[PDB]
């Protein structure tokens with residue numbers, strides 16, 4: 081039919097082949113005559129999927145053998161409290177770098193559970209940039225240092241990651257995990273709801289340094305201990321099997337296109353199409369982020385006033401664009417361009433933007 | 441290519457629900473996107489989300505003063521979320537033990553507060569539901585927790601106790617919406633979807649609103665989810681979509697009373713087979729407590745047990761091995777397990793007995 085361009089911010093576009101694959105075998109997976117949704121997670125067919133999703137991640141991000149990959153329910157939001165529940169012990173401090181709203185939500189949960197600190201923040205200037213690592217206020221009794229790699233709502237992104245040796249570096253990478261190569265051993269733990277860049281909602285990927293967290297924490301509910309899930313290989317209770325399956329399928333697609341390095345090249349190219357459009361618009365479009373901090377995953381911008389904002393967004397929606405409204409907390413526009421968003425969608429958006437401008 | 445899905449969790453689903461899912465997997469509701477590709481704040485998703493709640497409300501006749509939540513983490517997370525929210529200082533989490541799942545729930549409460557055992561059939565290896573006249577209740581109970589269907593042991597509450605000193609709370613993971621329910625008997629009901637309602641990944645929580653909080657993590661407060669209509673963070677959108685689909689199928693066949701008729705026929709096929717087997721097959725549960733959802737039984741010795749289960753597998757039956765903790769055999773016959781599968785099982789049971 082008519083064109084649809086999927087710029088949704090979370091859940092978001094999936095690569096077609098992962099969906100076509102799921103559709104074809106939805107009733108009969110691996111010749112079992114059952115859907116993968118109808119299998120025991122103790123079945124060999126399911127365990128194969130579960131293990132493959134782990135191995136694809138390991139290969140794709142080159143995760144070291146002393147790290148384990150967890151598949152957990154609860155979203156990134158649950159990790160905001162699980163992390164301090166496991167590591168924020170008495171006498172220690174949950175140190176946070178604030179670079180957007182998701183960083184604030186993480187901080188708030190640690191505040192419920194222990195001593196927190198703010199290592200650096202760009203909140204004063206409305207989170208238009210990533211602070212300089214030299215500005216980081218570190219504490220000897222920090223339980224960890226927590227960052228948000230990609231600030232989904234504000235459109236900013238870490239270009240690189242700090243070297244931290246006094247405490248584990250922890251990162252919420254929900255909206256840019258596996259959008260580029262990563263040196264996993266810079267971190268003690270990385271977590272990501274899958275629904276932004278890895279597939280479906282309903283599973284959260286947690287890459288953890290095994291020895292930081294494979295030990296029982298006294299007084300923590302069984303389900304909320306990392307140790308529980310490490311020990312049981314994320315099979316302590318029933319996992320989200322279809323979500324993990326779809327994650328597998330998406331990872332297979334990333335591998336098929338050349339991995340993290342190739343997808344980074346694609347992601348830089350799509351982002352460039354949109355930022356050049358902003359930058360050649362003579363101020364008709366104004367990006368929120370400072371140039372050195374521009375996200376490759378979420379492009380945030382405004383028109384010169386709210387009326388033009390609304391007319392632009394209404395025109396987009398009439399032309400088949402989905403998800404461009406900025407997050408409710410900040411308004412404006414947000415083009416989410418995660419791995420699976422196709423480049424011709426980006427070209428289409430540029431065309432929209434240029435004709436709207438010319439005709440305004 | 442015959443397969444009979446007796447899996448105990450996750451489990452068989454209705455063919456029409458899976459076929460419907462397949463058909464629109466790439467283009468949901470003419471949006472040209474999968475349901476999996478929609479924003480959870482989209483109207484498109486929001487209608488599905490609400491439709492799933494609406495169908496449960498209709499099918500279980502859930503009163504207006506109850507809210508229906510869709511949470512992640514399984515029934516297992518509920519084991520801790522419940523006392524986290526309700527087991528306040530000076531109160532007691534009171535448990536009725538009718539199997540190992542009961543035990544697992546009680547264990548989480550012991551982390552967080554005072555607990556108590558109102559009654560237990562553990563001594564007799566959980567062959568029955570205790571007499572409600574046996575319950576030991578406390579003025580300061582925060583709740584009374586039961587397990588409606590004891591998935592590993594094959595026993596099930598025939599009816600529920602009239603409890604007025606504290607909210608009655610039930611882990612209904614393996615029998616929710618397998619029969620009509622009087623929801624007003626309970627302060628809270630919870631269940632992973634993956635047995636009677638949908639695929640794994642979503643947990644249904646039906647809660648008396650006014651019943652349910654300083655210092656509990658935001659995500660672990662029921663109030664968070666009640667206030668946000670289970671859209672506080674990103675829900676498991678595909679699982680809730682599939683839940684809707686399964687609920688449409690249950691509605692289409694005539695609702696909770698209709699599915700109960702089917703379920704009672706399914707259970708009747710297996711229990712009659714066991715009872716008519718002259719001791720060749722022996723059910724674990726006392727008759728009066730027999731589950732309609734999980735039928736547990738053993739052959740006269742471990743070797744026959746093993747020979748039967750091997751023969752079963754060769755003949756296309758899946759999931760009949762009993763829980764590792766108890767061995768024997770377990771035929772899970774949740775809502776979507778068809779009558780024809782139970783007939784096939786019967787016929788296999790009879791042939792095996794004849795050929796032994």
Ligand SMILES: *Cc1c(COP(=O)(O)O)cnc(C)c1O
Nearest residue numbers: 155156157182232254273673674
């Ligand atoms: C989407 C998002 C979250 C929220 O994830 P849920 O799975 O909805 O809890 C947290 N952090 C970041 C950076 C996100 O973009």
Ligand SMILES: *Cc1c(COP(=O)(O)O)cnc(C)c1O
Nearest residue numbers: 317318514515516541591613632
């Ligand atoms: C299946 C089951 C559970 C476990 O559910 P998860 O979703 O795996 O946590 C808990 N209680 C009962 C009665 C069950 O049958």
Ligand SMILES: [Cl-]
Nearest residue numbers: 180181231233
């Ligand atoms: Cl943000």
Ligand SMILES: [Cl-]
Nearest residue numbers: 089090232233
């Ligand atoms: Cl967001």
Ligand SMILES: [Cl-]
Nearest residue numbers: 539540590592
């Ligand atoms: Cl049990």
Ligand SMILES: [Cl-]
Nearest residue numbers: 448591592763
């Ligand atoms: Cl079980």
Ligand SMILES: [Mg+2]
Nearest residue numbers: 332333335336
């Ligand atoms: Mg491949």
Ligand SMILES: [Mg+2]
Nearest residue numbers: 422423424425
């Ligand atoms: Mg194209």
Ligand SMILES: [Mg+2]
Nearest residue numbers: 688689691692
């Ligand atoms: Mg209908």
Ligand SMILES: [Mg+2]
Nearest residue numbers: 712713715716
């Ligand atoms: Mg008879």
